[PDB]
Write a protein that binds this ligand. Structure first.
Ligand SMILES: CCCC(=O)N[C@H]1CCOC1=O
Ligand SMILES: CCCC(=O)N[C@H]1CCOC1=O
Ligand SMILES: [Fe+3]
Ligand SMILES: [Fe+3]
Ligand SMILES: [O-]
Ligand SMILES: [O-]
Ligand SMILES: [Zn+2]
Ligand SMILES: [Zn+2]
Lengths: 318, 318
């Protein structure tokens, strides 16, 4: 029926056309240490975010999932300000990026319990004093493995999902562990229809994807526009991969996004022109402007795309 | 002549009796993600900190070095409030606890430069907008090695020390790398008389210490009261070790402290009773009330102790 957004509960029927994975703000853990050179300018950042939101509304986006983790600068009140200004629905996450705070607590024996308690509080009571609840649980695993640290979060996540029916969204590292993540969450009682395995576009072998899809989870091709960095494949390889699965009838299990960071937290930087040109398409219109057109030209039907941006999010949250 | 404190520049002659290593606030990196259950209560925390400061003043402490790293909740304005209330001098640090924020920047090729630039700005311009400058650079290495990540900070630190004459204070992990740290900083032009190698009390082999002292650096026995946790020796083993070096004439190179955390950031916790009893003496009076008395009884002279708490800090900062 309902999903919690940064502006409170909203009917799932009303979510409409949705990007499953975008960041208004994001910083890599440790950004907070770099405050003297990386101080947060709220009014300018709000301007950039409101601009990004409007752009999305231009292409009929009514809802955005912003899964920024707790230790990556998640800022619910700021997201609420963006939503209040634009009418955009924004759903935020509870979760951590892929030690030693939770490692210390593991020494105390309470760590996995504390993580569960955190998920429950943020899903059912509210984030800090913002009075905002998260709508998704955010998980991430490492390249080629789900570490013992990460598994605590996975187990906590599963446990929390059973109580709340919250959606789980995942991050996979460099195209690994898709099936392992799905299998492990299912072992601990999670519901596949409530799970999105993210960053699947980081692997070009459609066999890998089918292995993941066999579990009945959603997968996200959510890194469109990211090329030539962090061992990423090109958008063409993504399209090629995506086409294979669409033709094989998997549309009810696939969702698309860019994983943009519209305001970087911490110290400003400039990608060097080696990297810069390859990333030039990493913005929130790129799906609408460049990717979807190519898909049409390869005979993907509007009924199919609507399953991805409208039907799938709707089913996911219902 | 002068050292920067949280209340601005102060003549070194006026620093007086000094604890080289205590924390008013501290949290392990990642504490900020646990905001919903670990929210910071400023007025209560300020009360506890002011209490801790008064305790120290009772035993003639005029100056405290608080080397809380940037990503561990370092809060200069808060420290300034404690100092303004108590007349205590508090010197704070610039530095990081022992990825991926600075790992990402290493991908950009600017990381070590950015770190240096951060040290320079915080030593010579100010921390954020607080108008407070750090008085020490804070470094830490891992158990049994100084990683390539950590070396960036070491090289940045050395470089900064040459420009500013700032003091470097270090953390060693479980009694390793003392001599390596000293040797590496010296290779890059750091001045041994401006370096304190911390957590030396984590190793009980006085040969290890002498190896470190041969470089002409200060060493800190700064974990008094910490027992039965993370490879910590007992205070008795510390005393035994300390006595060997005092009798061998190293007093001009040794300093003492407790490495207290008076307000933990993040989620409150309680130590289990197995751990809790061993740690019962971990407070800022313990040196004064239990350790120094034992040293007197083993015939350590007041002239010697004064070299440690007064002469050494004074020489260190001058
Ligand atoms: C420039 C490299 C790509 C990148 O940083 N993507 C961001 C999006 C949010 O989480 C990520 O790591
Ligand atoms: C309870 C274990 C001991 C402990 O927490 N020491 C703290 C002091 C400050 O930096 C440390 O890591
Ligand atoms: Fe992301
Ligand atoms: Fe410390
Ligand atoms: O991401
Ligand atoms: O410490
Ligand atoms: Zn991700
Ligand atoms: Zn330390």
């Amino acid at each position: 029926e309902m999903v919690e957004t940064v502006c409170g509960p909203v009917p799932v029927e009303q979510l409409g056309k949705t990007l499953i994975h975008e960041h208004f703000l994001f910083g890599y853990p440790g950004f907070q240490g770099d405050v003297t050179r990386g101080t947060f300018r709220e009014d300018e950042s709000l301007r950039v975010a409101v601009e990004a939101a409007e752009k999305m509304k231009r292409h009929g986006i009514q809802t955005v999932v912003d899964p920024t983790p707790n230790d990556c600068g998640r800022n619910p009140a700021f997201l609420r300000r963006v939503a209040e200004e634009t009418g955009l629905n924004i759903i935020c996450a509870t979760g951590y990026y892929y030690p030693p705070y939770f490692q210390f607590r593991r020494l105390l024996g309470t760590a996995e319990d504390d993580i569960y308690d955190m998920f429950m509080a943020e899903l059912t009571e509210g984030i800090a004093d913002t009075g905002i609840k998260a709508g998704v649980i955010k998980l991430a695993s490492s390249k080629g493995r789900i570490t013992e640290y990460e598994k605590m979060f996975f187990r906590a996540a599963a446990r929390a999902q059973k109580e709340t029916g919250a959606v789980i969204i995942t991050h996979t590292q460099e195209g690994t562990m898709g099936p392992e993540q799905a299998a492990y969450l299912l072992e601990h009682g999670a519901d596949p229809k409530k799970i999105v395995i993210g960053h699947m576009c980081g692997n070009t072998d459609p066999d890998y994807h089918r292995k993941t899809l066999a579990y009945g989870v959603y997968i996200a091709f959510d890194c469109f526009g990211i090329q030539g960095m962090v061992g990423a494949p090109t958008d063409e390889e993504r399209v090629r991969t995506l086409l294979a699965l669409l033709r094989d009838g998997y549309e009810k299990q696939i969702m698309l996004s860019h994983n943009t960071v519209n305001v970087w937290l911490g110290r400003p930087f400039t990608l060097p022109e080696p990297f810069a040109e390859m990333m030039k398409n990493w913005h929130v219109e790129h799906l609408f402007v460049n990717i979807i057109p190519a898909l049409k030209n390869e005979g993907i039907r509007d009924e199919v795309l609507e399953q991805m941006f409208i039907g799938n999010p709707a089913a996911l949250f219902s």
